[PDB]
Write a protein that binds this ligand. Structure first.
Ligand code: HEM
Ligand code: HEM
Ligand code: HEM
Ligand code: HEM
Lengths: 137, 146, 146, 137
């Protein structure tokens, strides 16, 4: 991430605020519906619409991204326990980080049109791919 | 490969509202900005050196109109996407040597553009229907590799 | 998948020498070691927590024999892979929900295993023919996603 | 790369030793035959078997990998000239790095029977993916 990418991500993700749980849950729902293969990571969840488990998990995913934005120059440290969880314990397929990242971009585009310019789209894509690299390492 | 009536309703309800003069250029432009290696295929299009240069580039807009028209043609022939895209598959695969991963990427950029334009109307179920479509288009365009 | 008669002879001559009780387990084991998310689909196989646990696991070996047998059946009819993989595609796509990228990865691991076993005999042209085969198998296994 | 990955890569590449240039050239030949689309990046090359141009280029690729192995903790710096070349000037599709990486693994498997164990295979895969990340950044 360049300084320009970091500036773009902080501005755009700053707009999320108290919507973190709602947007995170929406991104998860987009992923589960669009790419049903990703559901094999959540057999222990109720994944139906309006699920409280998806809502609570969506807030964790979004809050983790907020912390990553706050520590964008040292994301390996900021995501280290979650890297152990995803890469070592759960063994999440790297393809699925691409799918969730796409669904996060779709959610942000649908809720923050003015912020989702082509340049900010590119910066957010790079940010999420960087997060994904840490979580798969 | 097969859309249910719910998925077909999702796609058709939205597609009539799509600005066919603009959305293709927006998707192609964002592809070139977000995935800059794709610019290798469009050297003849001129200035692609910045996001504003790409998005304002008349050849990007004009070509995007053709790309979207091919997507529209696929939407009119969902049960024969392979035959709808056979000539384009020969062009992209045998002639231009575009790796088919990029077909997936452009389909997903188009989905982002639809979300950006339509907001809350582009619900998770509507997106899921469009993902089946763009995956079907990508697979059809890749057929000459298969 | 279409091989020329020269390519077909090269592929089949090598395949006759493949230890079908071992090579499948080696390819499957290396898939589970090199790409550990694939382990999630084989939880019932027991201990997969270290490379030596995976490579020595009797269920990995036995299952790898079945995998190799399907590659063998596919080699017998490369021009109509649907004739060997139509039901296996329903299993992997509709029932197990394996991401199809992993079909490509397993095919490439199998190519690595063949190179490991055959050394200089696994020439660039022999590899190229096997790449056509494993790409066709992966594409056939993914048919129920298309 | 973990310490175990680095240890495995340094050990394996030590066994490669003075054969690195030959293995690089062989990997390129395998790539051009197995994935002929990659030939379009080399319009000025003779790409036939035994091409001195392919041989010479494989030795350059091998030298870069050897430097990366020697500087495995600082690969962005060690490979810095190559990122601009591959990402900006040539605009090499990221998928093609996976193709060359696979052909390098095939070459190493064909020449290093004892050293190309499953664990070392895994470490070398991650190493080549790490190199690829630098060249596409
Ligand atoms: C941007 C990428 C991601 C972020 C930031 C993220 C974040 C998180 C966090 C913070 C947790 C901890 C939950 C807790 O402690 O209660 C978690 C758990 C989990 N993640 Fe992710 N995740 C990401 C991608 C993925 C993907 C792509 C998958 C699979 C498709 C996945 C599958 C899971 C699972 C199965 C759990 C355990 C849930 C539970 O049992 O409570 N994650 N993730
Ligand atoms: C995935 C959906 C895609 C569709 C429906 C599509 C459609 C088309 C169409 C309709 C044409 C015009 C053909 C003609 O006028 O004869 C075209 C040309 C072209 N496409 Fe695509 N395309 C897609 C993806 C891509 C991608 C991902 C790339 C490269 C990254 C690409 C690169 C090109 C190029 C270089 C041309 C020729 C440009 C020219 O002649 O000026 N296409 N495509
Ligand atoms: C790409 C080449 C592949 C081939 C040729 C292949 C072949 C087979 C065959 C012949 C069976 C036995 C089916 C039966 O007895 O009904 C099977 C089962 C299975 N395969 Fe595959 N497979 C491939 C890839 C994969 C991959 C990549 C995964 C997971 C990452 C996978 C996971 C499974 C599982 C979980 C089963 C069921 C095992 C059980 O019953 O416990 N396969 N496969
Ligand atoms: C491990 C991955 C790779 C490494 C270490 C590598 C390394 C190198 C090196 C050292 C050079 C010479 C730099 C110079 O002479 O100034 C070079 C040039 C080049 N590479 Fe790569 N490369 C890699 C992957 C690729 C791939 C995947 C492609 C395309 C499929 C590619 C295409 C080229 C081309 C076209 C040139 C310029 C050739 C010429 O015009 O003389 N490289 N690379």
């Amino acid at each position: 991430l360049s300084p320009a990418d970091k500036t773009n991500v902080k501005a755009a993700w700053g707009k999320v605020g108290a919507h973190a749980g709602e947007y995170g849950a929406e991104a998860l729902e987009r992923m589960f519906l669009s790419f049903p293969t990703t559901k094999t990571y959540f057999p222990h969840f109720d994944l139906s619409h309006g699920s409280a488990q998806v809502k609570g998990h969506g807030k964790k995913v979004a809050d983790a991204l907020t912390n990553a934005v706050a520590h964008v120059d040292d994301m390996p440290n900021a995501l280290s326990a979650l890297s152990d969880l995803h890469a070592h314990k759960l063994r999440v397929d790297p393809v699925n980080f691409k799918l969730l990242s796409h669904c996060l971009l779709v959610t942000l585009a649908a809720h923050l049109p003015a912020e989702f310019t082509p340049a900010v789209h590119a910066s957010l894509d790079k940010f999420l791919a960087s997060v994904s690299t840490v979580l798969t390492s | 490969v097969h859309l249910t009536p719910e998925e077909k309703s999702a796609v058709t309800a939205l597609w009539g509202k799509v600005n066919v003069d603009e959305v293709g250029g927006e998707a192609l432009g964002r592809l070139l900005v977000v995935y800059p290696w794709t610019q290798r295929f469009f050297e003849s299009f001129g200035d692609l050196s910045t996001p504003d240069a790409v998005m304002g580039n008349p050849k990007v807009k004009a070509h995007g109109k053709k790309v979207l028209g091919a997507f529209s043609d696929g939407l009119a022939h969902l049960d024969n996407l392979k035959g709808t895209f056979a000539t384009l598959s020969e062009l992209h695969c045998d002639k231009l040597h575009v790796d088919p991963e990029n077909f997936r990427l452009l389909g997903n950029v188009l989905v982002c553009v639809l979300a950006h334009h339509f907001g809350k109307e582009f619900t998770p179920p509507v997106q899921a229907a469009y993902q089946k479509v763009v995956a079907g288009v990508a697979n059809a365009l890749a057929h000459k590799y298969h």
